[model samples]
Target chain A: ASTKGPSVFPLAPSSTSGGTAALGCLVKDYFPEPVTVSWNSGALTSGVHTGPAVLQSSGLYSLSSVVTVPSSSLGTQTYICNVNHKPSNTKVDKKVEPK
Target chain B: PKAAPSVTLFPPSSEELQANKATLVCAISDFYPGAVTVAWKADSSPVKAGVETTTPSKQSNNKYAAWSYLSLTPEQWKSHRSYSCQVTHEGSTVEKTVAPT
Candidate 1:
C-alpha cells in the first residue's frame, strides 16, 4: 500500500473578514504516527501564527484557521492556511470581502 | 494513521509595565507522522503568529511541538481585553481563552 496521502478538507471559504470568518480543514489518520499544522499568508512572513491544538478521543482530526483583518484590509490580499502532513500538505485559501 | 494535533495555552495571562512589552506564547502539539499548522486567534480573530524551533519533551509522549509568540505594548494588552489561542491540526482544532486578572 502506498503511504502517500491526500488532504481530507475540500471547502475553503471564498471570502473571509469584512466582519468575522472561519477557515477550517481536516486530515485523515496516517502512518506518520504524528502530524502538525502550518499557516501562511499573502505577505509570506517567516513568522508562523498558531493557536492551541486539540486532539479528540477518537482517531479523527479537525483544525481551524482564523483571523480578523480590519475591514480595510479585506479584499486586498489572500490568506492561505495549510496543514503540513509530511508528503501531503492540505491547504485552503480564502479571499476577504462582503460575499 | 495520522494523529491530529492538540491545542493548548500556558499561563494564558500576563501583565507588564505600561511602557514595557510582553510576550504571549501559543503552542500546537500532538499530530502523527508529520508536522501540523497552528494559528493564534484573538477574540475569535486571527493575529500574526511567531514560530519556535522544535523542542518536544519525550516525557509527555506527544508527536510534535510548535510555539507562537505575540508581543504587545502594555496598553495594547489592556485595550485588547481578553485573548484566545486557537490551534488547527489534522482537521481538528481546540482553543483556550484567557484574560488578565
Candidate 2:
C-alpha cells in the first residue's frame, strides 16, 4: 500500500532522566492501515505497552511508544527507538531523553 | 582515584558476513577524571578502530563515557570469533569481548 505517516523513534524528547519515558509512535493521515512495532534498543517484554494500531480516519492517529531506561543509563547516553509498520514495511527512529 | 570504564555489547550483535562491511559499537562507562583509550584487537592482533567519547548527557547520570566503533563487511564479521576492547588506567587493565553472533 502507498504509505505516509508521522515520525517514530529518535524523537528527541525534551526530558533527560533516562527513567520511564514514552517516546511516541505517531501515524497520521495515511492509508489508515495496521502496523507492527519492534524495538532495536533491547528486548521488549510481552504485553508491556505494545503498539496497537489506531484509527486515524477520525483524526490525530497515534500509538504510544514503549520505552524504559535504567537508572544507570541516566545521563550516560542517548538512546535510540525504532518502529516498524507492517503493511507498508516502513520504519522510523527517534532519539529521546528520559522524563 | 578513578574507575576503569565498563563496556557492553549491543545486539545487531553479529554482523552479516557478506562483504566486509559491518559495524560494532562498544560503550565504556565510568571513566572519570580522565580520558580512556579504546582499541580494537582481533584474536590478539590490532585492527583499525575509531573512538567517540561524550560527557554523560543526562541519560547515564552525567557520567564520563566513551565509545569505540569498528566497521567490517559481512565476511569479516561473520568469520571472526572475537573482538575486544582494552581499557587501561593507572596501570590497571581490563577488556570486554563481543562474540560473533
Candidate 3:
C-alpha cells in the first residue's frame, strides 16, 4: 500500500466574543495511523487541542486542531498547521492568517 | 504548573516487523502547560534520526497529550537489546522500554 500524506486547511475564528478566539486546522485523507499534528509555535499548551483521528468510512483518517488565544491578538497572530506523516516522510504545512 | 506525562510504549506490529517496516509508538498523556520533550534510545544508545514527536494536543480537561514515533529497519528492531522512549515534562523525565519480541 502506498502512503497518503494529509491535506491541511486553516481554521479561523467564526466570531470572537472579545476573549479568546479559537484557531486551528483540519487534517484529513491520510494513510497509516501514526501521524503528528502541531502549530508553528510548537507544542500545544494551555489552550490547544488536537482530536483523535477518526477512521473514515474508506479506512483513511481525519483529525481536528485547535489553538486558543486572546481575541486582541486575533488580527496579527499567525499560526501554521503542520501534519507530519511519518511513514511517507512527508510534512505538510498550512498557514493560518487571521482576518 | 506541571503534570508529568504517563508514557506507554507500544512495540511494532508483528506484520510490519516481519516485513522490516517496523515502527514503535510512544503515547504521552495527561500533562499540563503543554511543553514536552521526547528522546528515543536503542540498546541504551541515543537514536537521533527516524524519530518524530508531535506538539501536545490540549485535552477536554485542558491538560495536554501527544505521541512520538520511532522507525526502524528489520535488523535494528530485531537485533537491539531494547528500545526506550524518554519523555520529559517540566524538567522531570519518565521512561518506558520494550524488548524485541
What is the lDDT of every predicted structure here? 0.43, 0.47, 0.71
Full candidate order by DockQ, most accurate first: 2, 3, 1
For all candidates, state DockQ relative to the true structure.
0.02, 0.05, 0.05
Q: How well does candidate 1 score on lDDT at residue B10?
A: 35
* Model 1: per-residue Cα lDDT over B52-92, one tens digit each: 32333221344655554454555655666577766655676
TM-score for each of the candidates: 0.40, 0.47, 0.54
Q: How far does residue A25 in candidate 3 sit from its true spot (Å)?
A: 22
Indicate the docking level reached by candidate 2.
incorrect
Candidate 3 Cα misplacement greater than 4 A, ranges: A1-99
**Residue pairs in candidate 3 whose N, alpha carbon or C atoms collide under 3 angstroms:** none
Tell me the tens digit of each residue's lDDT in model 2 across B1-101. Answer: 67666554331221112323344544445556556666677767888643232323212334464445454555665566887777665567667675664
TM-scores of chain A across the candidates, in order, are 0.44, 0.55, 0.86
lDDT of 1 at B86: 63
Query: Could you tell me which 10 consecutive residues in candidate 2 chain B have the lowest summed lDDT?
Result: B11-20
What digit string (tens of lDDT, one per residue) describes model 3 on residues B1-101? 67788666666655445554666666666798898889999988999776767778787776788867676787888898899999988888999887775
